[PDB]
């Protein structure tokens, strides 16, 4: 499962890419 | 729930922004809940 997070991904997650929502950029974070 | 989809969201989803993965843009598509 993947989520856009404002700052860092979770310990259990890898930073797979980026999101752009309403002008704000997010880490795109997925569990492996 | 939100999903990163090439080109189109599903009819159950609203396009809220964009993903960028591996140099590629995707629509970021969310269901209401």
């Amino acid at each position: 499962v993947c989520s856009c997070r404002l700052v860092f991904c979770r310990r259990t997650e890898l930073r797979v890419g980026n999101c752009l929502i309403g002008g704000v950029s997010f880490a795109y974070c997925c569990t492996r």
Side-chain angles (χ1 to χ4, degrees), chain A:
Chain A
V1 156
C2 304
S3 341
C4 309
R5 307 197 179 294
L6 292 162
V7 182
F8 306 122
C9 305
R10 292 181 165 156
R11 160 185 284 328
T12 59
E13 294 176 337
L14 292 202
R15 192 205 77 81
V16 171
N18 292 282
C19 329
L20 180 61
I21 308 174
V24 187
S25 294
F26 297 69
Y28 190 55
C29 309
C30 297
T31 44
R32 235 212 311 187

